[PDB]
Each structure stands twice: as C-alpha cells, then as structure tokens.
Amino acid sequence: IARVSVCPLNVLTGFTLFVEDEDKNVNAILTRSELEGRMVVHLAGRCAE
Amino acid sequence: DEVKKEINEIIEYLRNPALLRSRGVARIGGVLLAGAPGTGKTLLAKAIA
Amino acid sequence: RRPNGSFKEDFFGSQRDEVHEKNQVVYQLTRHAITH
Amino acid sequence: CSEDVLGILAERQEAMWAGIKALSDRKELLGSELRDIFDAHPAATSRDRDARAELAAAKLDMTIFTEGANSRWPYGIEWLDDAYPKPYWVQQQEAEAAEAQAKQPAA
Amino acid sequence: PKRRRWLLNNGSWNFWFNFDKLYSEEIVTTWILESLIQTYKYLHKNTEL
Amino acid sequence: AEFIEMYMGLGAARVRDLFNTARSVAPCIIFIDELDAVGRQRQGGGRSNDERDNTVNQLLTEMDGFEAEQQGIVVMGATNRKDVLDAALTRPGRFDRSIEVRRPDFQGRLEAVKVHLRDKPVAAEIDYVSLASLMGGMSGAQIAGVANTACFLASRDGRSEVNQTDLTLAVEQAKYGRRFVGAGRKKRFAVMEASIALAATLLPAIEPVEYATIIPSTRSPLGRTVLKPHVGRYTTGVWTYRYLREQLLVALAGRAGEELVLGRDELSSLNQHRLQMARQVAWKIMNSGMSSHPDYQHLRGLGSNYFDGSSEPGRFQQTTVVMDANQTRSEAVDADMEVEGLLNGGYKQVFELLVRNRAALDALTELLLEREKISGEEVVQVVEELGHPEDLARRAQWAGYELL
Amino acid sequence: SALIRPGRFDRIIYMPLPDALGRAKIMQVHARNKAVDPNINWYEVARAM
Amino acid sequence: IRMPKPDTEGRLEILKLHLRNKQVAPDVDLLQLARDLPGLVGADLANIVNEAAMTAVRSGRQQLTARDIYAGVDRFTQGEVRPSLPTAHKLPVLCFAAKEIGIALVAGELRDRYGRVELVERVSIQPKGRAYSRTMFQRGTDEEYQLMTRGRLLDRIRLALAG
Secondary structure, eight states, X not given: XXXXXXXXXXOSSEEEEOOOXXXXXXXXXXXXXXXXXXXHHHHHHHHHO | XXXXXXXXXXXXXXXXXXXXXXXXXXXXXXXXXXXXXXOOHHHHHHHHX | OOOOOSHHHHHXXXXXXXXXXXXXXXXXXXXXXXXX | OHHHHHHHHTTOHHHHHHHHHHHHHHSEEEHHHHHHHHHHSXXXXXXXXHHHHHHHHTOOOOOOSSOGGGSSTTTTOSGGGGTSXXXXXXXXXXXXXXXXXXXXXXX | OXXXXXXXXXXXXXXXXXXXXXXXXXXXXXXXXXXXHHHHHHHTTOOOO | OTTOOOSSSOHHHHXXXXXXXXXXXXSOEEEESOGGGTXXXXXXXXXXXXXXXXXXXXXXXXXXXXXXXXXXXXXXXXXXXXXXXXXXXXXXXXXXXXXXXXXXXXXXXXXXXXXXXXXXXXXXXXXXXXXXXXXXXXXXXXXXHHHHHHHHHHHHHXXXXXXXXXXXXXXXXXXXXXXXXXXXXXXXXXXXXXXXXXXXXXXXXXXXXXXXXXXXXXXXXXXXEEEOOOHHHHHHOOOOHHHHHHHHHHHHHHHHHHHHHSOGGGOOGGGXXXXXXXXXXXXXXXXXXXXXXXXXXXXXXXXXXXXXXXXXXSOEEEEXXXXXXXXXXXXXXXXXXXXXXXXXXXXXXXXXXXXXXXXXXXXXXXXXXXXXXXEHHHHHHHHHHHSOHHHHHHHHHXXXXXXX | OOTTSTTTSOEEEEEOOOOHHHHHHHHHHTTSSSOOXXXXXXXXXXXXX | OOOOSOOHHHHHHHHHHHTTSSOBOSSOOHHHHHHXXXXXXXXXXXXXXXXXXXXXXXXXXXXXXXXXXXXXXXXXXXXXXXXXXXXXXXXXXXXXXXXXXXXXXXXXXHHTTTSOSOOEEEEEOXXXXXXXXXXXXXXXXXXXXXXXXXXXXXXXXXXXXXX
C-alpha cells in the first residue's frame, strides 16, 4: 500500500494506491493463491460496510 | 547490455571508416532503433553523435 | 479511434501466427483483464 | 488425454528437474543434450508409497455426464422430464428393453 | 432458430435463468402500494384545507 | 474494350466516329465484341457510372436514334449473357434477332474433328465417331487445342502425325490433366475406391460402375469411382426411397473399408466430404416425408419451403425454415435421434457387408494398385468370381428391373 | 521488405522501457529547473510508477 | 509465366548458392535446414545466411556453426533479441523452463511409443520478439502433412496440454 484516500475529486468512492513489483511475475503470470486473495480483498469492503 | 556491446561496432565505424571498411565486416549502411512508443531513442542517438 | 479477433481461427482457419506469440498474448490478456 | 499426460509427467520428476536445472544456467539447449540428460535419469523401476500417492494425484475429477447408466433417455439430467415430453424413439427403446428383460427370466 | 433453454413447464413456465423476476416484482409492487397508502393516510386528516 | 476510357467524353466520340465511317461506307456490318463489359444496366454505383453510362447513351441513339435510320445497316454484338445487358439495348428495334452459339454437339464434334485435321498430317486408322462420342463437353477452341497437342506430342516423339492411341491420351489429359503420391497414401486411395466399387456393385438399386481410378487430378485430391448415369431418374426426378437407402450405404462404404483394412487408429481425413454427403442424404430422407415417425411419416417435411432462383434460367434453390411454430421441441429430439440411427445403422450394415466379402475387396485393391485405373467389366468379373454366395443371389434376383 | 536487404538496414537494436532506477534518473533531471522539495525519495516515487 | 515460392528443393538450391563461397561445418545439415523454413522466397534466405555470418565473425571464428545459422533463422522467423528474464525471484524462470521441459519430455516419451511425433530440436528461454520461450521441432516431408490420421491428432492434443 502506498496511499489510502477517501473522496478523491469529490466522488463518492475511496482510492487505494498499490505499489507492485514487475519482476515477481513478469507481466504474464497469475497463480491461484493470488487470485483467491484478490477475491477476498474485493469483497472485504462490502462486508465491512 | 547487449545493445551497447553491439553498438561499440557502429561507434568504431563512425570513428574511422577506413579501418573496418575493408577489414572484413561489411559496411554499416543502416541501423534500426526499435522500442516502445516514446522510449526516447533519439537521446541515445545523440550520445553516439 | 483508429481500428483482436478470434472469429478468424474459428470459421476461416487462417492461423497465420506462431503458437508462442498467441500463447504470450493469452497470458498478457488474462493478467491485464484481472489485475490492471 | 489429460489423464494420460499427467500420468507421464508424474513419473519423470527427476528428469524434469534435471532439465530445468540445466536450462536455467545456459538458457538454451539442443535436442541431443536434452535427450542425454533425460536418459541419465530413467524412470523408477517400481513404485513406493510416495510414487503411488503422486500417481493417484495424477487423476481428475472432471465429470462425464453420459457415462454408463446415464446412456439412456434422462441422460443423468434430473429436471428433464419436467421440461420435455418423452420422444417417440425413447418410448420405442423403453418398450423393446422392457419386453427383452421380461424375456430374460423366461429365456 | 428455435429456443433451446426450456427448464420447467410443470407447475409454472420457466426458461434458463430468470431466477430473479418474482423477487423484483414483489419488491416493486409492495413499495408502490406503501407509498400510495401513506399519501392517502396523510390527506385523510386534512380535508377542510 | 476500345470504348473503355477514363477520360471525359471520348467514348461517345469513338462511337460517333465509328458510326459516321460506317454510314459513309454503307452498306455495312458493324460487329462489336466485349459488349457484356460496357452495356450492363445503368445504375447509381460509383463515379464511373457518370461516364460509362454516358457512353452507352450514345449507342442508344445510333442504332435507333433520330434521323429514323442511316441505311438499315446491320449491327451485331458478342456477349455471353443476354440478361446482363440493360433493357434499352436488347429491346427489339435495336437488336431484332438473338441467336445462340452453344458447344459442339455430337454432329458438330463429328465434323470439327475432321475439319481441324484437313490441314494436319494424320493416318488412316481413325474413326471420327469414336472421338466425337469420346470428348463430349469441350469447346471448339479445346478441340483445336487437343489437335495442336497431339501434333506436338508427335513432334516430341519423332513421328510427324498421330494414330488414335496417342491423341486419345492427349484428349484424356486435356480433360483430367497431368504430381507425386507416396506409397503409403496410395494404398489408402486403393482401399477406399475398391470398397466403393464393391458396394456399388453388390447393392441392387445402384447403377453399375463405369471406371475406377486412384490417380488424383488437378482439382480432386483423391481417387474417383464413377457410376453410369441412369437417364430415367435424371430426366423425370423419380428417385425412390430404396435408392436413397442404398445411396447412404454407398456414401459410407469408403470409411467402412478404410477402418476394416487399415485398423481403427488409421482413420484418415479423406472422408470428410463423404461424411457431409451422407448427412445430406440422411436429412433429405426426413425433409421429404419418408421418416418412420408416425407424426411425420407420409404427412410432413421439416418446416416451410422457400425457393429462390440460382445463376441460370431454370435453376431453383430450396430452403427450409423450422421454428417453434412447426416442431414442438420434442420432435426436434426425435428428428436428431432418427437421422443418427439412419447414419450409424447404415455404417454398421455396410461394414458387415464388406466383412462378408473380404476376398473380393483385396483382389480389387491389388488390381487397382497394379493397373492404376480399371473399367467396370473387370470389377464385375472379380466380384462375380469371388463374392459371397448370398450377396450374389440378392444381386441376381433384381438384375433385370429397369427402375428400383 | 525492400529496405531490409543486406547492406541497407542490416542491424536492428532494441531499446527497452525504463525501470525503477531509470525512471528515478529520468524524473530527477526534468526537475532541475522546476521548484521541488529537496527531500524527495525519487526511488520510492519511481517504484509506484 | 507464373511461378510462386520455391519448394524444399527450390530452397535447398538457393542456400547452396549463397553458402557456396562460405564454408560450413560437417554437422550443419542443409537439407533439414532448408526443410524447416517453408514459406520464404530467395532473399530471406540470403538475409539468414549473412546474419549467421556476421554473428560468427563477431564470435571470433570464421566457420559457421549450428548455433550461428540458428541465430540467423531466429532473427527473422521470431524477432530481435530482448533483455533476459529477471532472476531476482525464482518464479519466472522456473515457470517458463518447466513449460519448455514438459513439452520436450512429453514429446520424447510419446515418440518412443508410437513413432508419429517429431523430434525436438531446440529449447530456449531467451526472450526474442514477442515470446519468452520456445520448443522447436524438426519438420518432416510434406507427404506427412497431406493427411491427419486419428492417432496423430491425439498426439497433437496431448502435446498441447503437456506444457
């Protein structure tokens, strides 16, 4: 995580900026663990609300 | 790495043509610069010039 | 907008492409849809 | 085909790791060097416990719907007789099978 | 070009998907009725005005 | 083609000067070739329709025009199709007579074979009726070409003229053309054509064989077996139901024999089009009111028929529309089940047939491999001396019947 | 396919896209004239770009 | 007079011509090489040869080796060379190398059972053009590619899944 923010440009959504490394999966690889983690992180907001 | 270890050749040919003109390497009549859009290859060009 | 298609290898069978470049396109397309 | 391939690969694990280790260094190989590397590591002569576990994990759970007892009219679909009237040729099949199997005890 | 997605014609008539119309219609109907009824109940006490 | 010019307004100039010289040297005859490429119907179209149209307009005012005439000069034109030209040109008063030039008939070829060798050296042992009935279907230019080719082959042979035997080869290579085929792909050809021949000879409702070859031509990448055309059906259209069943068997015989001889794991992609042909037959049987479903048997097709004209005067193409308003959703399942029963029971039947007659099959394929092309009498003799007794009995029972 | 024949254009050289350090250097120089806070950790800012 | 691209023989003759003046090792097979470039017209072979030659003369040697002609074919068949794969993490090279060695190992095991599969020729994980890895095969005579039997298509399917 680089910068968490709320109400950018007055829109009614947040914005989390993610720093990622281009040399762990060189623009081409997707493993299963990573996809499941992404799913969990994308449902977390609704679940906390 | 490899592009410079190769363009030392064009450096030497643009230094003194008579040395490698008849030495055995054919005349360097044209070089191509490939990359992404806006890579700023022209900069590198200046360096050799 | 100045103007990919899979309808060419499905019905006309062109397949004018090495398998390696097609595989690379598939990898990058999935990763780009999912993580960008 | 998937089961066949996965059964091939989960016998030559040593050869595959030898090949990966060799290719990581030189980033290039010719088919003859590859062939001799694979030859240096022949497959196992017999199967111990670990080999059996790997071979057993070399199966799939892919469901094949029309298999065996599901080769006839419902075809293993459960909601089919609440969506479609039974065709005519299905009725003929059922009739001939009923009479044949009723001739089974009398034959 | 026939329709291939028959699913039920035994106690209703259904096609593949459409597993969300009963719910949506119940919601729409109940909400419109409740709004009309609250309007009626307010105006019922302000007839001289 | 001399009137085709992309400048502004010179086509009408050329028409005008041509017609003025013709009027000056009257009487005359004005022949215009390539008419089909300028006098097509006028339209909006592209920008050529601004000038190409204008050109034609000039024409429309010379043959009829004002001045009521010039002399009565005769004008004729070479076109391939009268329907492509517009109604203004081909109307009476601008083209009164319309005559046709077809390919040479039996008499036309009979006299063009000799008239093309009057100025050509040739021997005495020739029967022109043989070549007149032997190359029906070629154009006159092609007769000139085959004569040229026979003369040139004589040149390359050292003799000056040709007998029958070599100009026959010249015409046959002008028909089927003159590639290397391996020895493993050649036995596949042999086996499949031998199985087709054996089937077509042993089923009583199919015409006798004409010749069988395994030499691929320029357009067909495998061998061919040809049946003798039955003029009855071809002129009337009385194709019965018995014939369609046998034709299904004959369409699947190739794959049946391939899998029987070369084992199952050698099935090739040489029967892709014979599988499409068998599908055609099996779906026509259903679309023609010949099913055995009681709801379909002698009552219905599959849907609604619409015809549309092809690229010829008397040609039509059929089309069936099937919707929910004529097929009930469990008659679709029945149609599939029945067609598939036809296809696969037919495969099994022809397979057991070819099994019962293995000796004749192998004799035929050996003969085809050693001769590369055979005639129907050889096939008939082999099958008659080697086939199964029950099949020969079934074949001889229905021997004389004109139509089945 | 014409200008590629031997002698005319015989060598193609590839310029890749920059990396964290490359982007850091690139943005350091384009800012020498602008007004910029001195304590900018250019590497970290290039990590998220 | 209409003449299209040359056949395997049309190709062998051209590369015999352009490589007549130069010299080649005994092992470098010009027949198999001319068989593995179906679709080139004359001058592309000249480009291949001259690029192999400049690669070899930069190599401090003069005799063309297999690697050199292979480099030339790849500079035109595939594309220009590109920076190698990062080695900071195990994941990238492990994955791509496992892809290559799986294709190669499965091909070798199939060919030793039925005989229809080709021979694997070259395995590389050097980025080149738009791909990152390559398993190359020895192409056969065109007589072998006029048909497609059943077992041959089964083998194609298995080789597609193996990686």
